[PDB]
Amino acid sequence: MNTVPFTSAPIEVTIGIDQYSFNVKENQPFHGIKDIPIGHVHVIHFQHADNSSMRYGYWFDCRMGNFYIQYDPKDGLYKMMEERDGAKFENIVHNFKERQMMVSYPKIDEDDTWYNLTEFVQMDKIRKIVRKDENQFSYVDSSMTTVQENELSDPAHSLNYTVINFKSREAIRPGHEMEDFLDKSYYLNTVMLQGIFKNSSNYFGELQFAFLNAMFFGNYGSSLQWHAMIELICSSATVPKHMLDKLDEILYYQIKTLPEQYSDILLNERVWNICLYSSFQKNSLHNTEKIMENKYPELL
């Protein structure tokens, strides 16, 4: 089990650790988070009391180094940092654990929610889109834009999600115009699966990554991307049976976890009613369609 120590909490903030979150009062004696399950990626994120504008966050994997949090009053935020001095870190953590100034990552043992939300999310892969390579962790916020969003204005602070575009030469073989637009199997399987990700785990990873940035930060381009990657599968007549079944599970946990009051903005009616009732895979998403209909029947 691993630990993210905080130097201090100088301002009132709501703090998130994966799907958990708790309130820290301005200059409450707080020194961070313990018992973090090893073996998964994790995300720690922030919403100041004083400006609910700007949710922001750090993706990190404890196996890749020792990481702490420290408020920066110049720039005004909780910054993630790496401690390279190993014995200095262990000693700091022990002293704060002893004084019991840390909240325990509260995992119930029946609960596989996090793994189910993060199965194919990888830290070297996230770094292929949130380019900031001097650091082993990756910063995201609400207002970062995607590479494709800038094609329609700062590239270093962008989310280079894989570019999907259904009316594109990449997506449309010449002379199969109608075949390829109505049935995107060739885009999905050859261009994307074989050509880009290499495999479905990778494709599912980016899609999982897409959704969490959308849910955690309200990143609008992230949610366009999750929906796009969903749409490309739903709109393909020929999908490996293992892909479809894994997708049904993935979407099932995504839906289950979504806050019940955030759905209006984070769910696209068109994509889902297509996936679930018009597309080729209307029959194939049994778990996701049951949970959609019992929880958000309004959207349909």
């Binding site: 009316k167 030469r169 449309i172 115009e177 109608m178 637009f181």
Partner: protein, 237 residues
Amino acid sequence: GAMNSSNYAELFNNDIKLFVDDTNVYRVTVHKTFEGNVATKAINGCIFTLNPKTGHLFLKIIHTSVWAGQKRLSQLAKWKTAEEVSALVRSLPKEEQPKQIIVTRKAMLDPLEVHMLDFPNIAIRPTELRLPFSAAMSIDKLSDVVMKATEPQMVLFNIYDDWLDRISSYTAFSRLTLLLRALKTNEESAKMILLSDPTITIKSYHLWPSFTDEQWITIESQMRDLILTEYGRKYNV
């Protein structure tokens, strides 16, 4: 974006544009079968593409043989229309390619846009007008060439005959749409009007009679009476 009465005169500026109407590409007659069921029979159709400034009509004839062994013909017709318009642009020299293509039905935007991915500089737009171009098969010469055709075929026409020699594109197009609106609302009468006087002829190289200016005004008037009429006979007013 969309084309409506506000931006109506754009059509007659010097940017090259084509209207594309797909209403008559897929045409059937519906009959009973010996077992008492219904079946369709496709007849020849055509794609109606028109440069509203020059009058040039590119009339692509769609031979029933296109449909043989095809399914979902209504949806296929729209893709086949987009393929023919894309082929038409690709055939034209660059200075002759349109800068816009205005489709008369929104269902054609996606099928055309996908076919013109190679032309990112041609704008594909819809329209809010209720243009009468389906009535184009009520023009005898056009219906003839379509029904007699035995293979795919492109035939070129000026739908304005020689009108542009004496009037402007804006008025020629207004004339053409009045005549097509009348043919659409009551074909029999509209035709009766155009041909009542045997002394007025249709030159072999034209579609419409050789009216003088004063005869055209009398003609145009009667076509407006007709459209008002049929509106009453249809709405009791």
